[PDB]
Each structure stands twice: as C-alpha cells, then as structure tokens.
Design a protein around this ligand. Structure first.
Ligand code: HEM
Ligand code: HEM
Ligand SMILES: [Zn+2]
Lengths: 416, 414
C-alpha cells in the first residue's frame, strides 16, 4: 500500500497513513537496530551552545524552508512577495551572517513550534496563542517587566490564556538572553541536614543558585522562588515576583474534609522558561511560554512522584489504607483522591484546568484535524498517555508516529 | 554507539551494550520512531514454501549453537566443534537442520528472556518445556495441549510452560493453532452489531461455528480449539470443562459486585505466535505463565472494545457519570482491579498485581545489566495500563531491540 507509516487505532479499528513525517529534516535518536523513543533527553535536538557563527549555508537552507512554510501558510507560495522575501533573507545573511523575522513570521513560527511539539497533549489549542514580541528587550530589568506582564495577561485572574514572550535571538560572539529557572513559578527545594528535602526536590539546584546570588531563603514547603534573569554577557540578576501576581490554589477534597488540613497547594500557571524556540535556523534562547494545567501533572506527577513531593503514603495513611502490601492497591486509591482534590480545588477557585479524560478526547480530535490538514501529527506516545488510568483514555489505543518538525521547541544546556 | 540509559527516579545511569548483538531490524529510522505500533508492517514471517538461503540459515544456526555452548560453559570444547559440524552437514545436504532437546529447552527460555514486551521476565529461568516435535496429527496436538493445560494450571498453583510442535518445513504447510489463546471466551455478533461475550474473539468464534461448533449464548462461553496439521483443514476440539479453571469475580467489600456475574480464566496461554530458534521456526508453540491483575481488571474488562464494564460498575457504585472530572472511570477501574486480586487470592489461583510485578522487573533489569550488559524492553508495554507513574518502570528509560531466539507474530492461517 502507501509507502508511509500505517497507523492504527485499536479501539475503533481505523487506519491512517502519516505522510507528514516525509517533511522532517532533523534526525531523531532511533535506528533500525534499536528504538530509543523512551529516552527523555536523547543527544539529538539538544541545542548545545554553538558560540561561533553557524554555517551560513546551513542557516540559509533552514531560513528558506521556513520562509517557504510561511508563504505557504498565507497561500502566496511562488508569488513576487515570496521570492522577494527569500532574496531579502539571503542578502541579510550574506552581509551580516544572520537575519531577522518580520512580526507576522514570528507569530506564525511560535504557533507552529507548539503545533509541532510531539510531547504536548494540549495541541488542539495551538491556533490560540498570544505572542508577545519582546525582541526590543535590552536588560535583565526589562526582561522582568515583560515576564510580569506575561504572567498577568496569561493568568487573567483564573481564566488562563496561552501565551509566549519572545526575547532577542542569539547572535555570534555575544551572550544569550536566558531565564535560569525552568519555569516562571517553582517551589524552593531546601536540602536538609539529614540529606532529605523540604519543598520540591526537583528544584534543589536552582534554589541553591538563587541563594548563591543573594536570595534569602525561607523554610517552607511551598516557597515561590525568585527569578534569575540574564541579559547578554552579564551575570544573572535576581528578581522577586510580587505575591499578588502568583496565583495559587489551596488544595481541598470534595468529601474528605481532612485533606485541606494537609496544607497542600499548587500554582495556577504552568510556564516553561528554559527551552529554546527555533525558527528558520534562528535561535530564541529566552522565550517563556505558558498554557494551563492538565490535572494529572499536579495530582499525579508533582505530588506523587517518589522524587517529587511523594505524598502517596501520607494520604493513604489518612485514608486508613493497608500500606503494608501492594495488593491492597493503596497507591492507586490515594492517587485517585489526590487527583480529584486538584480538580475540585481548581474548579472551586475558578482557575482553568483540564482533566486527563477531557484532554485526551480533545487530543484525539486534534489528531483528526491534523490528519486532514497536514497528513499526520508527530506524537510521543509515552508523554501523551496520562500517568494514571492510561488505557481508560482514548490515546492509549492510538498508535503514534514520532518525528521532529521545525519550527520547534528544544531543550538547551543550562547557562551555568 | 551505546545508548546511555537513565532512571529519573534514582538518577542512576547505565549503558546498553547488548543492543550491539541485534541482527534483526525494528520499524524505526532516524527520520521517525514507530515504537508505539503493535504489529510490524514488514517484520512479519513470510511463507516457507521454499528453503531459506543456506548461508543465512547457517549463520543463524552457528550463532545459536555458539550461544548454547557458552551457556553450559563448554565453548570451544570438542562437543561444541562437533555440533557445529553436524549442523553444517545437515544444512548443506538438506537445506535445514534439527535441534537437540537440550538446545530447544535453552532456546525457549532465551526467547522469553529476549521478549521486550514482557514484564514478568524475572521468571525466565523457570519454564517447563514440553517437546512435542513427534506430533503428526491435530488429534495428537489436542492431547499435548490438554496435558500442557493440566500441568500449567496445577490446581491453581500455576507453573510456566511451553509446548513445542513440529518446526516449519519448505513447501509443506505449518502445524498451527488457530486460536490466539488456549482459553478464549466467545464473542457473538447480534442483531444490531452489538456483541455478547468478548468482542476481541468475534472472528475466531465464527470460524469455530463454521467448522461445526454448536454455539452457546452466554458472556463467558469457553471456545473450542481449532487445531491444524500440515495442509489439512483445521479440526475442532472441545476442551474438557474440568481442565479450564475459572475464577468467579467478587469484591472484598462491595456486596453487589458478585451480582454482575463476571469471571475470568486462570490460565493465560498465547498460542498464535512463532518461536524462532537458530533460524528454525516453530509455528505452533503455545506458552503460558500467570496473569498480572491489570490484564484482566483493566484491559480485558474495561477496554472500550472489550467487555467495557466501566459504566455498569460506576452506576452500581452510584458515581457521578455526568462528567469526566468526577473521575468515575478511575474510581471504578481501581475497584474492578481490586476485585480481580481479591477473587484470585480467594480461589487460591496465582496472580500478581502491577506494583509487585514492576518491582520484580526492575530487579530483572539490574540482573540483566550485570549478566548481558542490557535488556531489551518496550516501555509502552512494560508500564501498566493504570497508575503508570505510581510504578518504578515508568521512570526508567528503556532500549528496545530484537534479539534471537525470539517470539514473533505470524500471519493468521485463514
Ligand atoms: C493550553 C494548555 C496546555 C495543556 C493542557 C498542555 C499540556 C501538556 C502536558 C500534559 C505536557 C507534558 C508535561 C510533562 O509530562 O512534563 C505538555 C508538554 C509540552 N507542551 Fe503543552 N500544553 C498546553 C499548552 C502549551 C503551550 C501554550 C505550549 C507552547 C506554546 C506548549 C508546549 C509544550 C511542549 C514543548 C511540551 C514538552 C516540554 C518538555 O519536553 O518538557 N504546551 N503540554
Ligand atoms: C510468569 C508470569 C508472566 C507474567 C506475569 C507475564 C506478563 C506479561 C504481560 C503483562 C504482558 C503484556 C500483555 C498485553 O498487554 O497484551 C506479557 C507479554 C508477553 N510475555 Fe509475559 N508474562 C509471564 C510469562 C510469560 C511466559 C511463560 C512467556 C514465554 C515463555 C512470556 C512471553 C511474553 C511475550 C512474547 C509477550 C508479548 C506478547 C505479545 O506481543 O502480544 N510471558 N507478559
Ligand atoms: Zn523508536
């Protein structure tokens, strides 16, 4: 049949062929000999800091592909404007070694990067992204201003709006604009004398970096961390987010009245700030983006991972479950109630959130839309299927093809 | 060259060097990963009307023989040398060769050990191997199969086993078991497309009927076996009821669960896969172990295209099925899995929960890292269908590749 990957949905028995993968221009980590699809950070995309200017011949090809993508999106491929733009880009790279995007090209590129993200289950929303152009930013202080405005706009008192703020692109010999923190909102992780951790263990390194840079630490379990912002060729500067700007939700349970006594909580805005946005070969090292949470991220991963808050046993004990044996399914029961508490609480506080059932059903719609629009959709099964009740959702039974398309969001090395 | 493998829960790292011994290609390429696909597009097992290239077969045979003698610490011995000559001599003159029982036993265990989708491999060394290569008819296949079932069931104290029927031969038809498993519940299509029983077994149910079976009309009617000897139409055999151990499902605290009339068989025995050892192919080699509770409680009973009982259980529990956010599906699923564990435990039938199973698999990974420098594993199949990240394997990166001896899918015989 068709010389493309055949994809089956085992629930419905339907079949599709992915032809979009034919457009991938960047190799992944797999080979016919072995599959490395489960690796979180395979040395592939990894945007290792490439100081010296990038080969003009390579950048040019990437730039042309992106410009072609842009003109195709507005249905003017081959037009005079299309060829003239191509000429402009080639001329700008010729005399300067790099080039710059027009406003509309950046908006298109940022949305495409999200659309192309294989690990994102919320892509049905890809067309609705507020793109803040901060390419005029010239200092760490100004970065903070842009970031605070982003947070205010995106949070919108609980009715969250997806958004991305784009700071100046990378340039040869010159330092990068960087946000040291992995997310705009992170809870401190304080190493204890006995080796344990109070707070979020995932943030021990950034917490210590903040202290090394003048931050006076607290001693709580949910202390919001300050931001370490870095402008070109300068040491990072510390900035404390005004409390009124960081919306949080105290967690309570719909029927278990004691759950609220646990003093648990989480912040409303998920905003990734350490990834690199790549568009037409241009690299935006500082381009924080945010959406809204799927409840399992908080209730299952953040609160129950053994290496995170690890609250499973505490909650199970409160529920008076038999934690001495696996067959009682105490972990399963506790996790369900914790996830329900997250949903209930966000709903009570009128803060946007989506449960894993609703999110996956919407992602299935997205796959259908994309099959028609582009002939496929790059998707990472291991990241799309939720961390709890996997097979109870539709995506579990849907085979997926994973590949890299650009524009794209990529991991990049830590600045320190 | 060698992939770095990290466990995100513990921060530990290892390097898989075993993957270098892989000689068979998977479906992935640097351009795109097809790791989530269930069946191969090409990695199938094409017909065998003609003898496989002597050179290819010979290289596979030698490699296997080398594996075998290394396992008994007699590599380079006189026995090793002479065995290689025997294989060389038989292939050169006949285009094929035959395994010794001791080698078949080693090969079967290795095939299990190499299965990337199996989370129960810590048990790989404990496998009862029944040599059924002296079988010449469907009737004899039935006798062997019944004996396999009796031994494996063991009154509830399940024991892993495999029965190996005659290997495939050039230009001759294969010995085959048409059913995907030795124990399967019928799936009867009714008036308006709906299905009574197991929807996964509609096609096989109809085949049985077409071949003379008198169909029942229940939700859990055990199907008869369609056994096929070379180039003969399949023959129908009804398994003696006393040989098929079943477990009535009830819940530890929910009195009404038993009223649902749910049940499941004790013995999971895959019968439609091919066992490949040293280039030889065994088209009929049913193998069995014991169930992990999620297979029954989550997939078999809750999959939308299976018994799909989630909503019935939810209503009996008086849950709010009005919206997804009440997590009624999650609550119902947990209780259903608890009922499975409780019931099997009560009936004294071997079963393992997903937490205990994954912990043992993590031990297996460590054991294999020391013994062979790695372990092929398919993440999507190792991580349980419920409570994925609540188990250790979720946080463990895995490398998937094909090693031989191996169990592989093959075309349906009809
Ligand atoms: C509208 C709400 C959104 C929802 C519910 C959603 C949900 C998710 C989830 C559940 C993950 C996996 C998280 C993990 O397991 O670590 C994810 C990953 C991702 N999402 Fe979305 N997303 C949304 C918005 C966005 C936006 C606005 C962007 C970018 C413009 C985006 C870009 C990505 C990327 C690049 C990843 C992978 C990051 C990584 O590899 O760590 N998402 N998303
Ligand atoms: C002793 C207890 C055992 C347990 C608890 C166990 C558990 C499992 C589970 C949970 C699966 C995935 C099932 C699915 O999702 O469809 C599986 C697959 C598999 N197991 Fe094991 N296993 C055991 C014994 C065996 C034995 C005895 C063999 C072979 C001699 C074996 C060979 C395999 C193979 C080849 C697969 C993949 C089958 C397929 O592709 O559909 N397992 N096992
Ligand atoms: Zn792969």
């Amino acid at each position: 049949g068709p010389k493309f990957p055949r994809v089956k949905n085992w629930e419905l028995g339907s079949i599709t062929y992915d032809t979009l993968c034919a457009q991938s221009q960047q190799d992944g980590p797999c080979t016919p000999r072995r599959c490395l699809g489960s690796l979180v950070l395979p040395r592939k995309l990894q945007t290792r800091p490439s100081p010296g200017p990038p080969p003009a011949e390579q950048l040019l090809s990437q730039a042309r592909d992106f410009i072609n993508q842009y003109y195709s999106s507005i249905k003017r491929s081959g037009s005079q404007a299309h060829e003239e733009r191509l000429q402009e880009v080639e001329a700008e790279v010729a005399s300067t070694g790099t080039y710059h995007l027009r406003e509309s090209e950046l908006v298109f590129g940022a949305k495409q990067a999200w659309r192309n993200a294989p690990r994102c289950v919320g892509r049905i929303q890809w067309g609705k992204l507020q793109v803040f152009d901060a390419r005029d930013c010239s200092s760490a202080q100004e970065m903070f201003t842009y970031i605070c405005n982003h947070i205010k706009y995106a949070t919108n008192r609980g009715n969250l709006r997806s958004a991305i703020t784009v700071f100046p692109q990378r340039a040869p010999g010159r330092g990068d604009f960087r946000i040291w923190n992995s997310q705009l909102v992170r809870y401190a992780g304080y190493r204890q004398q006995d080796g344990s951790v109070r707070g979020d263990p995932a943030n021990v390194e950034i917490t210590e970096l903040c202290i090394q840079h003048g931050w006076t630490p607290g001693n709580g379990r949910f202390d919001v961390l300050p931001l370490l912002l870095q402008a070109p060729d300068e040491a990072p500067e510390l900035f404390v987010l005004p409390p009124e700007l960081v919306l949080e939700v105290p967690l309570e349970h719909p029927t278990l009245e004691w759950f609220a006594a646990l003093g648990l909580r989480w912040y409303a805005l998920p905003a990734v700030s350490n990834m690199l946005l790549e568009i037409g070969g241009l690299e935006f090292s500082a381009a924080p983006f945010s959406g809204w949470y799927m409840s399992t991220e908080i209730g299952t991963r953040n609160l129950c991972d053994p290496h995170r808050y690890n609250i499973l046993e505490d909650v199970a004990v409160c529920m008076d479950l038999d934690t001495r044996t696996t067959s009682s399914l105490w972990k399963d029961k506790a996790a369900v109630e914790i996830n329900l508490a997250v949903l209930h609480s966000f709903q009570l506080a009128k803060v946007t959130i989506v449960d894993h059932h609703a999110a996956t059903v919407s992602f299935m719609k997205h796959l259908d839309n994309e099959q028609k629009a582009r002939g496929g959709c790059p998707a990472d099964w291991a990241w799309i299927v939720p961390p709890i009740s996997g097979s109870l959702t539709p995506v579990f039974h849907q085979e997926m093809v994973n590949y890299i398309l650009s524009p794209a969001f990529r991991y990049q090395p830590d600045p320190w």
